[PDB]
Design a binder for this molecule. Structure first.
Ligand code: FMN
Ligand code: FMN
Lengths: 217, 216
């Protein structure tokens, strides 16, 4: 697969064609990509809101009013809009949920194997939630890893997307009652097909030279 | 078929030290690191790419104490990437990014460049002046790069594993990162898994979508 060509062709969509929708199969693949991203210890400390109705997208778009109005149209016009959310705390129940799911999927040959996995994950989680008091940051980082996986994955599907931090995430959290549910919103990714007006699709891609960013040893 | 790639890649537990990347694959690895997106194209990152035994040994110093279980992966993989974030978003870096965008022909006019610079500075100021979280903001962009990278190398047919289980203070000291304005965050060995790594064969486990996805 020519993934480098995918990486060089994908770009941050500036306008979506509001008439072009994902197929049913594409929508399923989108959710599979969200689900199957890796994460530290397979902790999966995340929730996703996938908005595909006009009202659902309008609820997300409420967070882009005023200061962030330049991002509001992207949210309204795309086919499917993903709100990436992190857990606000790594609680005991979630750690148990993850390891129980690994058992349900047949990853452990014995109780001892499950216990070793649980102990190892709990060690890392405790380092963050007890020692460093940064489990919120640790989990948010895993969500961003998922975003990076997602942007390349949808590009490889032939879909356009744009990662969006330019919204009011406090408004978004309130609109979707996220804090009470144990989550906080971090990134919005509209997905679809760019419009004929979006000339960012052809503008040269710009990055700092490797002589600046890469040291080879 | 990127979904098949996503379902086949896995966290490699042991690498075959005899299986090196080709020269072309090594170039593609660096292209993937360079061309990841980031908020405002801020690219707030540096990468150490170790491909010699001496270079991998420097990285492996961090896989000590509790983290010895990750030492072999770092030594045995063909190429090992240390992902680093800037620790502060300074004016000079913002100017460097926008000057590079001009050099690449993204702006029709000085006015267009000025608008781009103003918009990026607005976001940077929100983090570095208002929220005082620019370090966290930049680290998040590095993790986005990691996620792009893991899927990209998988699509190239390469094995990899993201590693947080090392002592990043040792890694920072070894590479003098803090005084240069950087901190190391993730180590990703890349290569081909050992035939003895049966984690390649075990079922992939994730929470059901009924738990993690709300459709609206
Ligand atoms: C986390 C993140 C947030 C971003 N926020 C926005 C945004 O709010 N609106 C927007 O139009 N583009 C946004 N961008 C797109 C970036 O400007 C873009 O990724 C960068 O300029 C690199 O160019 P490319 O994505 O076209 O390769 C965001 C990108 C990332 C990764
Ligand atoms: C940021 C990050 C850090 C990780 N740390 C380690 C590590 O130190 N050592 C390791 O063997 N695996 C590590 N893992 C691998 C995870 O356990 C793995 O991604 C998770 O179990 C999901 O399964 P999969 O990657 O096989 O699909 C890490 C993964 C991520 C994303």
């Amino acid at each position: 697969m020519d993934i480098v060509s995918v990486a060089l062709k994908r770009y941050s969509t500036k306008a979506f064609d509001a008439t072009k929708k994902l197929t049913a199969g594409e929508a399923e693949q989108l959710k599979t990509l969200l689900q199957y991203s890796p994460s530290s210890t397979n902790s999966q400390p995340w929730h996703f809101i996938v908005a595909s109705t006009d009202e659902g997208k309008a609820r997300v778009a409420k967070a882009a009013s005023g200061t962030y109005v330049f991002n509001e149209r992207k949210i309204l016009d795309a086919s499917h809009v993903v709100v990436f959310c992190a857990k606000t705390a790594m609680d005991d129940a979630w750690l148990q949920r993850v390891v129980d799911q690994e058992e349900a999927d047949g990853r452990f040959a014995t109780p001892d194997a499950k216990a070793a996995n649980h102990k190892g994950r709990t060690f890392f989680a405790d380092m963050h939630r007890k020692e460093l008091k940064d489990d919120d940051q640790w989990m948010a980082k895993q969500v961003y890893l998922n975003v990076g996986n997602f942007l390349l994955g949808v590009a490889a599907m032939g879909l356009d997307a744009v990662p969006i931090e330019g919204v009011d995430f406090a408004i978004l959290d309130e609109e979707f009652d996220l804090k009470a549910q144990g989550y906080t919103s971090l990134v919005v990714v509209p997905v679809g097909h760019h419009s004929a007006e979006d000339f960012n699709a052809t503008l040269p891609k710009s990055r700092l030279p490797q002589s600046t960013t890469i040291t080879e040893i």
